[PDB]
Design a protein around this ligand. Structure first.
Ligand code: MG
Length: 1044
RNA sequence: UGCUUCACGUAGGCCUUGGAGCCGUACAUGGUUGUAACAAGCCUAAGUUUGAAAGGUAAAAACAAC
């Protein structure tokens, strides 16, 4: 054991050198006014510490210039007469933040790994298989595009290698935490080596003198992020500016240029923060980044200096709410309704032009004002512009909450885990067809809201019973059918409708089932001429079976000149609406790539038709499905996938004939936006070129290349009747609002309206109850201010698409708040009794009624909520019997990170501590958050005091501590500090040390140390103050700190 | 001490998500050729909250060859 004991001496020397050199916990304070203390520069920190333990130290430092000055030597901007007052806390060393960050990172990552493990166990140690599919959803900010492409192809080859990599990086993170939480430790995880011995190793397999692949992965990720930030900052640099953000960009590019994974022979400070913020939560990484960096509120360019550490982070998927579920749905509906929608229908272009002019004129008037109360008096006219408008999702959520979907099947979005299960679980063409589809049918439950919205449509499945057979029929329900379903629910409870004969109650699900059966039985026996039920004969049965010509007619030139013109103006409209945006490189991905690919496909099709190739010669020269997926993947991430071998393998070779018009310009520009403007300009030039060559000789020239076809064939009816029978669509007017109280009076009152529909009746009924609609403001306060260019006869151009779309807005808003009102019935137990005022015409030169003061939903969105903070245990267990607390929480700060923060700290601060209820009588979220974060700000101070005390303990008796790590049939872990060793201990050593005590325990000190390690709120505030005061006095006895 | 940060702790302080041109979960998102526009859009009635009927564009969802 001579080599073993020699390993002990060399590890002891390494540990001693590490403790002497790299285990510095030295705090440091800023310059300016903080460094002006001079003599009390020698004595500041403990003078703060006593202030934050209870002692009365007055801030009697009032140093003044004491006179009037003329020279620049005075130069002090001392307009704030108060001094430091020993309440602000100084910057601590990186080791304390790293210790807390690695402990929190190991906690949250072990929690996420355990959750992924139980999810994959119930759904059917490196998380191999679909375990890494969930873990790769979680690991970065959704950066699993290569893994998604691999499971879409079916390779399942990168998953095992990525699983090893994840296991190795988890062990590296665990060893980094175990180093950083302790004082007496080998310098292993900082300078990646094998000081353990490489032969005597009881499953401490950190590196085994071969896992420099962990280092390779670390430099790969660090350098990828570094050159990505260099490219981004280069793109910002040459932008326009007032020579002020140019110097800021120069400072940022000075900071990023540097860093590196290796400094001297160690990982150094930046890469440790990179690993920690990679393994942390998003808010935890942001907090540790803004504690590490001196910048408090990052603005302009400097967000990138934060973002360098917060680019990866963790995903943190959505949370399942159990107490305030309906209140959260009400808040979401109100947040949707508090915003002006952005309709893309033209002839509303002056509306949004005036909206943009008004908003740009008032956002500059928001500045150059005084205080915060006068700012809102000018900010109140700025109209928010909405994001989503998911009317179909909210309708289907209302039908899901009341369990109105029974005996059905609803298409839901496809997950990568479902794709992998379909891959491992396997007529081959049926499986190939199901593989291409991105939706799946399953029985709807309450806890499922992944509804498939494909161009505002939803998909249903019905089980009609022709001759006892179980023929499943897919439908496609229009968004104006579910809206009428919600109306029939919301007017008459226990919904029913009556038909033309015997006037029964028809139970709309049974109406849909009978309609599917009747459509099947009518398609099976032609009958496309008679009307169906009472709808029409042409509102069902499309033009493939109704209108037909016996002989396929010759394609005329005017049809081609119309198709070319409509494609040209559609491309021009897209180009103008993309150039109108402030950041053009964020608009679309399915639309920008498809324009380029349709351009190259049309150019290839013309070049291959005029050269007269074959039928199969087109297909094998084109892009296959896997080749399409590769093309879309390498075009979406063109800045990342530019220099790889696959890019030049599939683009510059193997496919040079197809991609011919773009390879000339692909060697100059280095972005997706670079290869988009050239392609759309080439498309416009090509359409303008071939528009003038559609003479009668070149009629077949621009035929099958453009896919222009006339009407159908008479013989092609029986084949269509066997494929349009299943998978047809449901029109919006299948159900009739005949027996609703007020229908006949409305039809009698509105008789000189020849173009009326049931949506006017829905508008009248839901406006009888009172409610805003987002369109009364649009046509009574902003509309009369704008002058419109006329038509040849009409006073406004584009009438039939101007008002109708507005009506298509209006009743939809009158739907949505009604649903929200229902959730208030599920929230407080009482009806919504607030009265809403009407609106009047403006008839003035300017606009006087502010959107933020006249929209009632925007006023409700800023006024309080009720909540229940009953505590929750681990896993998906039920709420335990605990006292229920109510606080006043704003609806804005009611998102998912509040749902994490509440169970993290708010319940333990309400229960264990004793807060005051305030003037109102209920707690407020702002004061609670301020008190919790103020009580957690001193926590790294606590760990600094503990580390200084332990360093002073282990610096003496170093041979005594080293002699009690001999062997355990091999090399032990060289760390001794664990505060619970059975031979000599360390909490007992501090317990019988110079710690004065009257009410104390060694177990209490261990509990306090575990709490300051893991950032958990203290059980008793008073005992924690006693421990803090004892440690402050013990540190001040031996002159341990640099403040002595 | 040190390759570091210049800032006196905590909470506050909103149009179009610039700094993420390579993020992301609320979907026309899996290709070529023929058949496919009932559903969803987009244009055509109106100085006002009239989505009917009609006339063009329009391929979401589907069938047969690779
Ligand atoms: Mg119509």
């Amino acid at each position: 054991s001579g080599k073993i004991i020699e390993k002990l001496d060399e590890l002891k020397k390494a540990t001693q050198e590490s403790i002497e050199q790299r285990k510095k916990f030295d705090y440091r304070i800023g310059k300016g006014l903080a460094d002006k203390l001079g003599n009390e520069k020698d004595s500041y920190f403990e003078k703060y510490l006593r202030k934050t333990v209870g002692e009365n130290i007055p801030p009697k430092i009032l140093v003044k210039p004491k006179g009037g000055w003329k020279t620049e030597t005075k130069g002090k901007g001392k307009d704030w007469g108060d001094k430091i007052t020993f309440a602000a806390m100084p910057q601590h060393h990186y080791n304390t933040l790293l210790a807390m960050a690695f402990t929190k990172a190991h906690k949250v990552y072990s929690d996420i790994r355990g959750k992924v493990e139980i999810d994959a166990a119930q759904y059917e140690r490196g998380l191999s298989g679909l375990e890494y599919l969930m873990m790769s959803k979680h690991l970065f900010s959704g950066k699993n595009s290569n893994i998604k492409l691999a499971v879409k192809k079916g390779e399942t080859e990168i998953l095992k290698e990525y699983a090893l990599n994840e296991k190795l990086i988890y062990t590296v993170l665990d060893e980094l935490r175990n180093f950083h939480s302790h004082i007496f430790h080998e310098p292993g995880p900082v300078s990646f080596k094998n000081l353990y011995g490489d032969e005597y190793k009881p499953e401490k397999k950190l590196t085994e003198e071969e896992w420099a692949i962990a280092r390779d992965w670390f430099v790969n990720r660090f350098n990828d992020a570094k050159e990505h930030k260099l490219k981004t900052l280069a793109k910002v640099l040459e932008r326009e500016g007032t020579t002020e953000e140019k110097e800021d960009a120069e400072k940022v590019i000075k900071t990023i240029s540097g860093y590196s994974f290796e400094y001297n022979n160690c990982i150094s400070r930046e890469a440790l923060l990179f690993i920690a913020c990679m393994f942390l939560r998003k808010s935890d990484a942001a907090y540790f980044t803004k504690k590490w960096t001196g910048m408090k509120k990052a603005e302009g360019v400097f967000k990138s200096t934060q973002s360098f550490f917060t680019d990866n982070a963790l995903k943190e998927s959505k949370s399942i709410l159990t107490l305030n579920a309906d209140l959260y749905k009400y808040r979401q509906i109100l947040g949707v309704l508090s915003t002006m929608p952005a309709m893309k229908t033209d002839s509303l272009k002056p509306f949004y032009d005036f909206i943009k002019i008004n908003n740009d004129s008032y956002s500059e008037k928001a500045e150059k004002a005084r205080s915060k109360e006068e700012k809102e008096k000018i900010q109140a006219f700025i109209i928010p512009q909405r994001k989503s408008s998911n009317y179909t999702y909210w309708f289907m959520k209302y039908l899901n909450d009341n369990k109105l979907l029974d005996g059905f099947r609803i298409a839901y979005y496809k997950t990568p885990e479902d794709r992998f299960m379909y891959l491992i679980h396997n007529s081959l063409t049926e499986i190939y067809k199901e593989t291409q589809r991105n939706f799946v049918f399953k029985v709807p439950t309450i806890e499922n809201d992944n509804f498939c919205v494909k161009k505002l449509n939803v998909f249903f499945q019905t089980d009609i019973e022709f001759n006892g057979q179980k023929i499943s029929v897919q439908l496609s329900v229009s968004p104006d059918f579910l809206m009428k379903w919600v109306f029939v629910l919301l007017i008459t409870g226990e919904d029913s409708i009556k038909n033309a004969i015997t006037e029964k109650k028809e139970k709309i699900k049974d109406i849909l089932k009978k309609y599917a059966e009747e459509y099947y039985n009518r398609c099976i026996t032609s009958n496309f001429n008679e009307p169906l039920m009472g709808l029409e004969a042409s509102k069902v049965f499309p033009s493939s079976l109704t209108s037909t010509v016996e002989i396929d007619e010759k394609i005329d030139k005017d049809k081609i000149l119309m198709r070319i013109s409509e494609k040209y103006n559609e491309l021009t409209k897209f180009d103008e609406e993309n150039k109108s945006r402030k950041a053009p490189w964020r608009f679309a991905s399915k639309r920008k790539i498809d324009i380029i690919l349709d351009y190259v496909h049309l150019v290839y099709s013309d070049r291959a038709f005029d050269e007269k190739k074959s039928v199969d010669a087109m297909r094998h020269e084109a892009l296959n499905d896997m080749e399409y997926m590769d093309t879309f993947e390498y075009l979406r991430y063109y800045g990342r996938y530019r220099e790889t071998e696959e890019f030049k393998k599939i683009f510059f070779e193997d496919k040079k004939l197809y991609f011919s018009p773009i390879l000339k310009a692909m060697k100059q520009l280095d972005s997706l936006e670079g290869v988009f403007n050239f392609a759309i300009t080439g498309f416009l030039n090509y359409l303008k070129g071939i528009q003038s060559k559609v003479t009668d000789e070149n009629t077949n020239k621009y035929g099958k290349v453009f896919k222009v076809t006339g009407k159908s064939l008479t013989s092609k009816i029986g084949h269509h009747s066997e494929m349009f029978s299943v998978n047809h669509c449901v029109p919006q007017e299948l159900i009739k609002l005949n027996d609703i109280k007020g229908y006949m009076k409305w039809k009698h009152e509105t008789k000189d309206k020849l173009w009326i529909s049931d949506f006017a009746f829905i508008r009248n009924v839901l406006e009888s109850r009172g409610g805003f609609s987002n369109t009364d403001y649009l046509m009574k306060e902003v509309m009369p201010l704008i002058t419109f260019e006329k038509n040849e006869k009409g006073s406004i151009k584009g009438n039939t698409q101007m008002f109708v779309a507005l009506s298509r807005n209006k009743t939809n808003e009158l739907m949505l708040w009604e649903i929200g009102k229902y959730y208030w019935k599920e929230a407080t137990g009482s009806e919504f009794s607030r009265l809403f005022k009407g609106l009047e015409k403006n008839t003035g030169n300017k606009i006087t009624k502010a959107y933020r003061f006249t929209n009632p939903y925007y006023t409700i969105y800023q006024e309080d909520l009720d909540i229940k903070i009953q505590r929750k245990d681990k896993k998906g267990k039920v709420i335990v019997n605990s006292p229920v607390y109510t606080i006043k929480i704003k609806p804005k700060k009611f998102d998912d990170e509040y749902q994490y923060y509440e169970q993290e700290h708010i319940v333990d601060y309400i229960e264990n501590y004793e807060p005051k209820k305030g003037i109102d009588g209920h707690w407020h979220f702002e004061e609670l958050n301020k008190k919790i974060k103020d009580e957690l700000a001193r926590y790294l101070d606590d760990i600094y005091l503990l580390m200084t005390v332990e360093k002073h303990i282990v610096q003496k008796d170093f041979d005594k501590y080293a002699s009690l790590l001999k062997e355990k049939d091999s090399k032990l872990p060289p760390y001794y500090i664990g505060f619970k060793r059975n031979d000599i201990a360390l909490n007992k050593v501090i317990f019988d040390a110079l710690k004065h005590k009257g009410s104390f325990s060694a177990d209490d000190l261990n509990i306090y140390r575990i709490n300051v390690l893991h950032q958990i709120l203290q059980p008793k505030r008073e005992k924690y103050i006693i421990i803090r005061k004892s440690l402050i006095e013990y540190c001040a006895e031996n002159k341990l700190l640099k403040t002595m």
